[PDB]
Amino acid sequence: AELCESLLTWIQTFNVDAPCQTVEDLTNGVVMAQVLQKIDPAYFDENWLNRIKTEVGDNWRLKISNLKKILKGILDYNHEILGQQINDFTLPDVNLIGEHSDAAELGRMLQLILGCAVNCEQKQEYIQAIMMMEESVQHVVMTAIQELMSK
Amino acid sequence: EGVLANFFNSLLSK
């Protein structure tokens, strides 16, 4: 904890198209998918984004379907592009995100997305941007990176 | 907190 909301602030620095003001705004996967496209548009391309349904509303079953596709993508990216540098021993429980808006599990998913950004080809620029954020956010991001980069 | 910069610059150094 203290992860989800600091990482929400970080997510907000991408200024994606979908609303990203609240925890609930992240539960259907669309914001996450748009952020991943910004992180690596060569991998998280339009063909991939098309699989994420928009206008989900309160349909938690579709939320979960979207989130499973997002997590699949992250884990494939980690394996195929990042050489397994992100620690994926504990997977976020996307069912609890969909069914209960569980912000702790959401924080874990956001941590994986952070791991993509700080290991992608543009990692220098993502890290430099983090270094401009509020100190309280940077400290949580630091702890999150320590965890995800450890073996 | 300046030590935060050491952490992030250390990532950049790797």
Residue numbers in the entry:
A (entry chain A): 10 to 160
B (entry chain B): 441 to 454
Which of the paper's sentences describe this entry?
Cytoplasmic dynein 1 (dynein) is the major minus-end-directed microtubule-based motor in eukaryotic cells. Here, we show that a conserved amphipathic helix within the unstructured C-terminal region of the dynein Light Intermediate Chain 1 (LIC1) interacts with diverse dynein–dynactin effectors. The dynein LICs, comprising two closely related isoforms (LIC1 and LIC2), consist of two domains—an N-terminal GTPase-like domain that interacts with the dynein heavy chain11 and a less conserved and predicted unstructured C-terminal region, referred to here as the effector-binding domain.
To further understand the mechanism of interaction between Hook and LIC1, we determined the crystal structure of human Hook31–160 in complex with human LIC1 Helix-1 at 1.5 Å resolution. The electron density is well defined for Hook3 residues 10–160 and LIC1 residues 441–454. As previously reported, the Hook domain displays a canonical 7-helix calponin homology (CH)-like fold, featuring an additional helix at the C terminus termed helix α8. Generally, the structure superimposes well with that of the unbound Hook domain determined previously, with an r.m.s. deviation of 1.4 Å for 136 equivalent Cα atoms. However, the Hook domain-specific helix α8, which in the unbound structure is fully extended and interacts in anti-parallel fashion with the same helix from a symmetry-related molecule in the crystal, is broken into two helices (α8a and α8b) in the current structure, giving rise to a V-shaped hydrophobic cleft that constitutes the binding site for LIC1 Helix-1. As predicted, the visualized portion of Helix-1 is folded as an amphipathic α-helix, with its hydrophobic surface facing the hydrophobic cleft of the Hook domain. All the highly conserved, hydrophobic amino acids of the LIC1-effector-binding domain are directly inserted into the hydrophobic cleft of the Hook domain, including L444, F447, F448, and L451, explaining why the mutant MBP-LIC1F447A,F448A failed to bind the Hook domain. The Hook domain also interacts with a second LIC1 Helix-1 from a neighboring complex in the crystal lattice. This interaction presents the less conserved, hydrophilic surface of Helix-1 to a less conserved surface on the Hook domain, which a priori is inconsistent with a native interaction. Yet, to rule out this interaction, we generated two Hook domain mutants: A138D, testing the presumed crystal packing contact, and M140D, testing the anticipated native binding site. The Hook31–160A138D mutant bound MBP-LIC1FL with the same affinity as wild type Hook31–160 (compare Figs. 2f and 3g), whereas the Hook31–160M140D mutant failed to bind MBP-LIC1FL, confirming that the native binding site of Helix-1 is located at the interface between α8a and α8b, and conferring functional significance to the conformational change that splits helix α8 into two helices.
